[PDB]
Subunit: 156 residues, 10 copies
Amino acid sequence: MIQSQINRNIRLDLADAILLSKAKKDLSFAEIADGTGLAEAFVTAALLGQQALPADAARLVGAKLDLDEDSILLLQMIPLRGCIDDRIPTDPTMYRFYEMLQVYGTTLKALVHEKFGDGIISAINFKLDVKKVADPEGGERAVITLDGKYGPTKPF
Amino acid sequence: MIQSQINRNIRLDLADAILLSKAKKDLSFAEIADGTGLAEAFVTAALLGQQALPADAARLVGAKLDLDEDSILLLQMIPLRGCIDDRIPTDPTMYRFYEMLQVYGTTLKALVHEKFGDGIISAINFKLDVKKVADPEGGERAVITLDGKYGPTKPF
Amino acid sequence: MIQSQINRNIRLDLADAILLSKAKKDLSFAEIADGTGLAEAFVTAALLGQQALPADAARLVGAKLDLDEDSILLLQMIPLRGCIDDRIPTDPTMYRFYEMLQVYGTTLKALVHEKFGDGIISAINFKLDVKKVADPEGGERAVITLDGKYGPTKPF
Amino acid sequence: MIQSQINRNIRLDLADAILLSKAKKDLSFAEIADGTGLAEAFVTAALLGQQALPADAARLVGAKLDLDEDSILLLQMIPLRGCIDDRIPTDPTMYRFYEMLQVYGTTLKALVHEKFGDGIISAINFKLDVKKVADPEGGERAVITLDGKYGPTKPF
Amino acid sequence: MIQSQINRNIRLDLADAILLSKAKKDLSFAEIADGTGLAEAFVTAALLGQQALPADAARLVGAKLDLDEDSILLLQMIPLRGCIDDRIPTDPTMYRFYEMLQVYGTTLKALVHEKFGDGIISAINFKLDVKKVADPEGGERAVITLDGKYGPTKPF
Amino acid sequence: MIQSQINRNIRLDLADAILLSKAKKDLSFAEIADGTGLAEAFVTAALLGQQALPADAARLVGAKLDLDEDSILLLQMIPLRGCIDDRIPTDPTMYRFYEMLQVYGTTLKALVHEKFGDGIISAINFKLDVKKVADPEGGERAVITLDGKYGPTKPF
Amino acid sequence: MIQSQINRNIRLDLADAILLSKAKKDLSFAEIADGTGLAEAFVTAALLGQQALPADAARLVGAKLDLDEDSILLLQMIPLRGCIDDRIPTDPTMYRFYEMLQVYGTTLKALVHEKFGDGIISAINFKLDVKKVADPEGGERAVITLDGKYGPTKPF
Amino acid sequence: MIQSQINRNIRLDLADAILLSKAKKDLSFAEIADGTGLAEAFVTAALLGQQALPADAARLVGAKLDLDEDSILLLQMIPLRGCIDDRIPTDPTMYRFYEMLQVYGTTLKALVHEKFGDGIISAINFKLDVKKVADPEGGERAVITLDGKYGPTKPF
Amino acid sequence: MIQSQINRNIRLDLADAILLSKAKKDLSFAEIADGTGLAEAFVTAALLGQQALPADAARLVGAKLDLDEDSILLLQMIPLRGCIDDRIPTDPTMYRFYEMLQVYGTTLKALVHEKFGDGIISAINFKLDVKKVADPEGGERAVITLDGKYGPTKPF
Amino acid sequence: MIQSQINRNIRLDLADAILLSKAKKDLSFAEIADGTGLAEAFVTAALLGQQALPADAARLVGAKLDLDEDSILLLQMIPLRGCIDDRIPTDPTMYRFYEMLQVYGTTLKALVHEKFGDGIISAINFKLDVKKVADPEGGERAVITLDGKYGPTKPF
Ligand SMILES: [Cl-]
Ligand SMILES: [Cl-]
Ligand SMILES: [Cl-]
Ligand SMILES: [Cl-]
Ligand SMILES: [Cl-]
Ligand SMILES: [Cl-]
Ligand SMILES: [Cl-]
Ligand SMILES: [Cl-]
Ligand SMILES: [Cl-]
Ligand SMILES: [Cl-]
């Protein structure tokens, strides 16, 4: 039977324990996700309390991190999502993505409406990936792809 | 000589005027950016108060929209950026992008650090584009590409 | 060509002007929406700045309320949605619906996950209606039906 | 003698404990409420700290979830209601209901006034239900009924 | 036909105009409410944007204050209630009532549950009045009576 | 020697403990206050962290509730007052009193100035009481009397 | 007949107008208050919208500043007090007084309780004054005296 | 070597421990400060986490309160100052001082500039004291003296 | 006679007008400050509403910018300082300096106390300068000097 | 393999423990950084939760402060940066730096754009240092150098 959470702190506290174990074993997120059949971004989000893992995935990652049974079960719960402590991130790495919204948010709105119509780009029927690409002028770039279904707003 | 703003309302007010003229002319953002030599997302952001236009681009969009001289000059000013009224968007279209951050912000941090290192993905050495694609299951998807330079944090 | 707004105040100001005209004409929302082929709740939301009217509906309500042509154009624009002044309503009538959320919000979450699965009930592929019904104890009850598409959360 | 709470955290902590036990026993809200005589939405709210259970109902769910005596007594206290952590939900599932208020809040006010009069729809003399119905276009919809008593404001 | 407002500023701007007129004419709230058949507290609230006046009363006070026809019509509209600028009053006079709530809010909850039961004391089926009474130790006291209908929580 | 607190959580945690004991003993606030020689509203406020009890009163209620010595001492400390978790109550019962302020706050100010003059109605030289009265139309009413000293504001 | 305000902006706009006139006439606050029979701090507070001037005082300062009749009448209105734009001052001069509260707030509470008892120091039965004193170490000191009536909190 | 704090909770937790000890020993702030060679307002602020004590004073109050060695050392650390829980005090005694700023803040600014010049009155080169005096009308008054260095603005 | 402001909006509106003039005349801040005797950062801050100009400087910049006489007088007013619209900047340029505080704020505190002692570094007895320096790795660096007086916190 | 944090409280709690050990040992930040090969400002930031230490430095400081192995590993984790408790500092020492931004933020933006162009001064490719100098008038000044890479905003 599906199970769900109502207070994010239980899974965020689990996330912290996970991260300590991960550090102690010197694991990467890529290796934790290996063997689950699920994308790195998805599995990582689950560990960090933002997604639910299927039972087999939860058992796999649970073994890798030496998690107790309650933790493995907690990983299967539908989370109370929301990773940002207090609405606006303080962390520079997280903050840049918020800044992308402060600069381009209305442009995204305008261009969504022009290209698709009234409605939204989904954050649920949605996937994300992060790719590293050499910058021709020197150094490295992140190409982050947000891929969401268009959901139209129609009269009724 | 470069000129900058300190109060977003001057350029946001201009944005409203631009949008009224745009609607009265039945123009698209694509048509407006055509011929400027600049990406639709960049020109649109400028119109909306979030970027500066080079003088030739400002004159051209100003011709297409019948803008007065002060307005064409204002478009060339470096803006006081920040498109969101009060930190968290109320508009569903804009809000979904903020929700992507509430769900995946910590995952983005974790994967940026694993793939690149301690530091940030730049919102300044940065570009974005919105592409409409088919959903294999039916309907349409937005593929929004965020492309930013990795800026490392190294000890001193 | 589709036209969108980025500052809610343009359409909220129009809403105030529409309400003054409506009051002067002693009109109801039911009669305004009559003949548009659209639901009362949708046409009302549009007048109040929260939905876009198709051109024919816009012209029709425009005639009923003696609106100028800038106003009839504005009603066709995709809004910058968000009717609540500052996050939490002050108005008792509006506040009670927010109280429903403070009391039953987590129960809605819990029951949605149990009955449907991980995911959301859409606010976009969505309709609502308000019905007045006798209370068996005397007085009257409102039966407000929220009817939203189940959007499943699917793992990638 | 009736007993009441003043700090939501006591019951919200109990809720988390109840959810862990529920998950360990692989129980549904439907099953837990069965035998209480009370609607699934009401019993669920109680478990989640938002309603009081009568003594016999408290004892029944207590036995089902292996709760201790203090916990069974706490479930009978009139709660300090308010399930939302910090005014605006972060969770996408809960957020959609808040968005419904950002879009339709003023429409609900207007239509309540037109259909009933000056006053409010109650969240306290109130019932909620969640039904799943097939969507004719494919997939599923939630039909959520908010049924509240109309309370008029009349002059004095 | 009933008419309603959605933006408090229209009626609050009217209130300021009413106050200037009232001051120019050196009138009291008592005098203004005389002849309306309505309590001084109710009429005063209406003038200040927090209640609607019936047509006859609107015309009466309108004549007293030399108000125009749009103003008299606006007083008849069901307001978007909420008199406090930004949630917590700054004015010492208004603040003391807020402080009463900070000191006795939980006591009021507890005693209401004890004396009446689970539910609320209505702010809608509600009257209030302000009386001046001599203080036996010297000076004067305000006896402010809040008189609301007990609305019991209805299980389901 | 008088003793005061600076951190509300200490007395609020005690309040939670008092309420558990109270519920275990199935006691009323009326009976707890019996024999203290003090008003139910004052004693209740003390238990809930918002007033200090005189030593004899503290010992009396402490005996009734089986409190330890640290607790009986804490009840005598002048509290760091403020019962509302985060400025605006979430609980419906408490919220109604806040709504009274949102609706009538400026009316209270206006009538206080008219009936008394410039200044305030005291929250300190102050008493309140809650009375249950039959409603002639059926059910019950709460008559809550706020009784405050007028403190004038005069030039210096 | 006493007259009162409910929106601070009316008197704060007047204040700005007063300050412009004052600057154009190169007047001091000391001189504006001379002949009024009222303290400099009181009259200044009134000009700045935080106190009300008696009629004679209003006419006197109004002639000095060349104010119109509506402005002189406004100065006589009981204000909606609250000079700080958004709770915490941004201005360094004003901020220091807020910092004094952040550093010594709990100390003031503690010493007030020790020296006087439970209750408050009045901000209404209150005066203040600002004196310049030479610092023996060089420069100048401000000696700002807050002088308020003790208001005891007693059991009832 | 000087030692400093970065999280106020360490010293505020210590403050609570100090106040419990102080209550158990029935001590006054005056008595605690006696023999330290420091003003009671300074010592009290240190106990409450808002100032640092020199070693000899720290050991002396530590003896009077039976504090352990880590606690005596903590008292010598430069604090992370800020006594107010969440910017605006809820406690009536503390709130009154905030209200003095809401009523007189702009007056203080204006009179500081007129009597001293552009700049600030220091909250650092600063002392304060609380004196109890007789009110000539009956009762008692607090004379609270804020004594700060004038810091002129330095053009460059 | 010294003159001061209480509402930042008066000088910020002047700042916007200044910036339009400056743009139209294609002037730099460097050149506007030339001949005033005041540092570019000081004169710029004045134009932007954060410092006062002496009369000669106000006349000089006034002539350069074609300002009217009221504007020239307003520049001499002691401002109500605070350039950030709503506490946390939205503009990326401004935000980076806030981020420096988010990352290094506690380090600055710690190293100020170790190097100087208990106290503060002044923003009032203060100078600022910005210098462009070649980056040896390519590009340019800003070397920004904050030079403030150390104000010790000593016991009393 | 790099390891990162998502909850600042883990490293901030470690910082508090570090500071206690540092006080007990009577150590300076200068001493602690000695022999790391890293600047005092960088190592201090690390201890305080705002930077990561390389493994060798982590072991060196860990030895000096008697930290356990989990603590030494924690210091090597990439932090969730953000040292300010709630956006605006309460601590006077920290606050002055925020006040530098309230006074000069818009000036910094303006001069950055004039001297460098559209874009930012980096908080990442960044360093800072704090220097103590004599003040010519007596006392001491802090010269704090911010040194950041210019990151241009260019069209695409
Ligand atoms: Cl990825
Ligand atoms: Cl694009
Ligand atoms: Cl409907
Ligand atoms: Cl249901
Ligand atoms: Cl009355
Ligand atoms: Cl009572
Ligand atoms: Cl004075
Ligand atoms: Cl003292
Ligand atoms: Cl410079
Ligand atoms: Cl340094």
